[PDB]
From a paper:
A separate and broadly conserved two-protein complex called [name]/4 in yeast and NIPBL/Mau2 in humans loads cohesin onto chromosomes (Ciosk et al., 2000). We show that phosphorylation of the Ctf19 kinetochore protein by a conserved kinase, DDK, provides a binding site for the [name]/4 cohesin loading complex, thereby directing cohesin loading to centromeres. Phosphorylated Ctf19 interacts directly with the previously identified conserved surface of [name], explaining both the requirement for DDK in centromeric cohesion establishment and the nature of [name]-mediated targeting of cohesin loading to centromeres. We have shown previously that [name] recruitment to centromeres requires a conserved surface on the [name] protein (Hinshaw et al., 2015).
To observe the interaction between phosphorylated Ctf19 and [name] directly, we determined the crystal structure of a phosphorylated Ctf19 N-terminal peptide (MDFpTpSD) bound to Scc21–181-[name]. Iterative density modification with non-crystallographic symmetry averaging revealed extra density near the [name] conserved patch, allowing us to model key Ctf19 residues, including the conserved F3 and the phosphorylated T4 and S5 residues. Coordination of these phosphates traps Ctf19 F3 between two aromatic side chains deep within the [name] conserved pocket ([name] F328 and F263). The structure also explains why the [name]-m3, [name]-m35, and [name]-m7 alleles abrogate [name] targeting to centromeres (Hinshaw et al., 2015). In addition to direct coordination of the phosphate at Ctf19 T4 by [name] K331, residue F324 stabilizes the position of [name] F328 and therefore aids in recognition of Ctf19 F3. [name] residues Y298 and K299 were mutated in the [name]-m7 allele. Y298 helps coordinate the phosphate at Ctf19 S5, and K299 makes contact with the Ctf19 peptide backbone, explaining the contribution of these residues to the [name]-m7 allele. We found that Ctf191–6 phosphorylated at amino acid residues T4 and S5 bound Scc21–181-[name] in vitro, while an unphosphorylated peptide did not.
Author numbering:
A (entry chain E): 3 to 6
B (entry chain A): 2 to 528, 533 to 622
C (entry chain B): 2 to 67, 80 to 98, 105 to 133
Write the structure that this text describes.
């Protein structure tokens, strides 16, 4: 989870 | 040696284009009252240049057009001279209509109407003008459908949509619901046009919390990625997610379809980032759509996390709510990084101004849902600061009325005032009405008869406002909401839950008791899979099992296991002691009856320490 | 016969809730509007003009003072950059002159409303  | 004052026509025009496009590059760099006069200097020049070409030159119909348009675009996005921009667009239209039968001027003429009926009245934001635009937009559409050519049928569909979008602004919510269906019913099935108009309908209902009719709900589920393309599809996914979050449903399937989407279309939102979505309805009828939060990859994940974080607010105590106390602040920073690093362009400074203003509202949602997660977990309103309007109507005076009820102050004044004023959403109207019925019903029980004639009076009113705002919104399909309605009716129309239960028929008891059984059978400490299951809301789960254990359980080992549990749960969130007490009396009976000796002794000590705290100084 | 029986403590569940707001009802008001807004629906007009250099028309751009109009610009709600760290550089030379020339009209007016 949680990209950038 | 060069001239600067007797220039070719293409130089004049390319200078208007340069002064503008240079402003479009320093738009995200204004930091001062000065730099603002620099930005709007470059725009002042570009507008007065385009005016020169119109007055000091002889322009062809195509040059009057592409020039008048480029100028009006700037008047509309940069000034308040809306009356003026409407002059240029009506003149250009009236000229194009002289040549219109010996020259092809439909695209220009439709684009003029679009400015008069859509682009302008929206920037104006005036009820008077909206009311006129609609008069005109109808006159246009009612007139075009009488032309059998395939073009004029597609343009009427475009202005039928402009007609709707105005009614939404005029808040004529029946016309909106009627037209949206007459528009969608005419659109060629499984077309990118119908699917865009439908995405607009669903999202319109969610904004008003209206219930989403079935055909629209299937139309939304049946959107095909390859006919609508990654921008409009990431919108379809956003809407379904929001639909779950609204019925407090489960969002795991949805956060996974978003991952299957993102794994194969992330570059579409990053490489194509900026270029928007263009809905080619026809040869020479193509509409561009920009949805900045939904279409740009970074901007979407930030929204998408705040939703995942608002679902888990109610889980709060010790697991999934650890996800919310971890990820609401990252929304705040990733939202703050989108503001600091805002880039032009090449759009107006005010385009980037409003995209900042939406980011600032996302900041305010986070500073709210932290205060809510602090009021679940701690049983009090942290109130704190002041200079915020609440990201919604009166989420401040809801938070502030709750701080009054928490302090035993009743807050019957505040909750009626909040649910009376027309500005508040229908949901917050209901949260204010239930908390009212809860406080009014509490008094019917614990008040004398002197005050009760007036208070039996109030409990009836406030219950029907609830029967209302529930039946016309989409809350009626949220299980946590329907159940809280059950819990409160039973608690107020049955002993030993009210000292003075309110009158009711045998049929109405048969109704509600049969309801609770569906909720109880499906959420009791023996968990399934269906439309009656509830998110692990603590206060909600505890009351469902007190209520349900006490009315539907008959074995005594069963009834001891349950009250043992309910009683221990109450410690998980603050502000629960007076409920923990009424649960401990109940456990205390079940222990004495079952002769569980020691348990009758401990539960006495646990109840002694609660009475010590409930009556503290 | 239980503890605090005599005290003034709620004895029934409905009474335990008078000072308990149903705070497990988290409002979602406004979150859909956060998807749906801001939203622009626009109509491209992608057509070139003045590509034909064949043009013997020419203009004397000495604008300024010379129906009606008095443009008023929109006071934006935010600055678009933070002041914790001149904008004519990059203008072509013809452009930069015209601007030095008509420095008088860059006496605009910024205001706000709707």
């Amino acid at each position: 989870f949680t990209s950038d | 040696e060069n001239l600067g004052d007797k220039l070719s026509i293409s130089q004049v025009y390319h200078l208007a284009q340069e002064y503008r496009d240079h402003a479009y590059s320093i738009a995200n760099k204004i930091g001062s009252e000065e730099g603002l006069k620099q930005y709007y200097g470059l725009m002042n020049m570009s507008i007065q240049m385009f005016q020169l070409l119109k007055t000091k030159c002889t322009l062809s119909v195509l040059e009057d057009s592409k020039v008048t348009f480029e100028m009006v675009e700037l008047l509309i996005q940069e000034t308040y001279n809306f009356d003026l921009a409407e002059l240029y667009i009506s003149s250009l239209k009236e000229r194009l209509q002289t040549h219109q039968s010996d020259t092809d001027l439909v695209e220009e003429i439709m684009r003029c109407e679009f400015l008069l009926l859509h682009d302008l009245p929206l920037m104006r934001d005036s009820k008077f003008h909206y009311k006129i635009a609609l008069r005109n937009c109808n006159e246009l559409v009612q007139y075009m459908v009488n032309l059998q050519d395939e073009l004029y049928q597609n343009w009427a569909s475009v202005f039928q949509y402009v007609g709707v979008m105005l009614c939404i602004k005029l808040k004529q919510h029946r016309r909106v619901k009627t037209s949206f269906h007459g528009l969608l019913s005419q659109c060629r099935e499984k077309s990118q046009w119908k699917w865009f108009l439908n995405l607009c309908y669903v999202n319109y209902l969610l904004n008003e919390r209206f219930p989403i009719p079935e055909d629209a709900l299937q139309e939304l589920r049946s959107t095909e990625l390859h006919t609508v393309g990654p921008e409009l599809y990431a919108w379809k996914l956003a809407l379904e997610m929001v639909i779950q979050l609204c019925k407090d449903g489960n969002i795991t399937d949805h956060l996974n379809e978003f991952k299957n989407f993102f794994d194969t279309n992330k570059q579409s939102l990053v490489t194509n980032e900026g270029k928007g979505c263009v809905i080619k309805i026809m040869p020479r009828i193509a509409l561009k759509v920009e949805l900045p939060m939904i279409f740009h990859y970074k901007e979407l994940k930030n929204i998408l996390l705040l939703l995942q974080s608002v679902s888990y607010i109610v889980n709060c105590y010790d697991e999934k709510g650890n996800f919310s106390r971890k990820f609401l602040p990252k929304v705040y920073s990733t939202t703050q990084k989108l503001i600091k690093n805002i880039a032009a362009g090449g759009v107006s400074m005010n385009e980037l101004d409003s995209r900042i203003q939406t980011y600032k509202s996302i900041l305010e949602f986070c500073e709210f849902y932290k205060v809510w997660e602090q009021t679940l977990l701690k049983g009090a309103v942290v109130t704190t600061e002041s200079p915020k309007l609440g990201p919604s109507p009166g989420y401040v005076r809801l938070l502030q009325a709750m701080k009054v009820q928490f302090e035993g102050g009743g807050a019957v004044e505040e909750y009626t005032r909040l649910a009376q004023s027309g500005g508040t959403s229908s949901e917050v109207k209901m949260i204010s009405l239930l908390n009212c019925y809860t406080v009014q019903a509490a008094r019917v029980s614990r008040c004398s008869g002197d005050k009760q004639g007036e208070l039996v009076e109030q409990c009836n009113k406030v219950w029907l406002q609830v029967e209302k705002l529930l039946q016309e919104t989409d809350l009626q399909f949220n299980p946590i909401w329907e159940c809280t309605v059950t819990i409160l009716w039973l608690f107020s129309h049955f002993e030993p839950f009210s000292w003075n239960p309110l009158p009711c028929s045998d049929k109405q008891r048969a109704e509600y008791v049969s309801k609770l059984r569906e909720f109880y059978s499906s959420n009791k400490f023996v968990a399934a899979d269906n439309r009656f299951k509830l998110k692990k809301a603590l206060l909600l789960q505890i009351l469902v099992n007190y209520l349900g254990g006490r009315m539907l359980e008959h074995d005594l080992g069963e009834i001891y296991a349950i009250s043992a549990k309910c009683f221990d749960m109450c410690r998980q969130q603050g502000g629960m002691r007076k409920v923990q007490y009424v649960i401990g009396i109940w456990h205390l009976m079940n222990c004495t009856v079952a002769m569980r000796g020691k348990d009758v002794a401990l539960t006495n000590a646990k109840l002694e320490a609660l009475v010590k705290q409930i009556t503290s100084v | 016969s239980y503890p605090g029986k005599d005290k003034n403590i709620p004895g029934r569940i409905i009474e335990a809730l008078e000072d308990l707001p149903l705070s497990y009802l988290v409002p979602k008001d406004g979150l859909a509007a956060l998807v749906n807004a801001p939203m622009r629906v626009s109509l491209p007009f992608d057509k070139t003009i003045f590509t034909s250099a064949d043009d013997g028309r020419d203009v004397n751009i000495n604008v300024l003072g010379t129906e009606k109009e008095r443009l008023v610009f929109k006071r934006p709600s935010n600055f678009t950059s933070s002041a914790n760290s001149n904008f004519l550089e990059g203008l072509s030379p013809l452009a930069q002159s015209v601007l030095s020339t008509h420095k008088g009209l860059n006496d605009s007016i910024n205001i706000e409303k709707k």
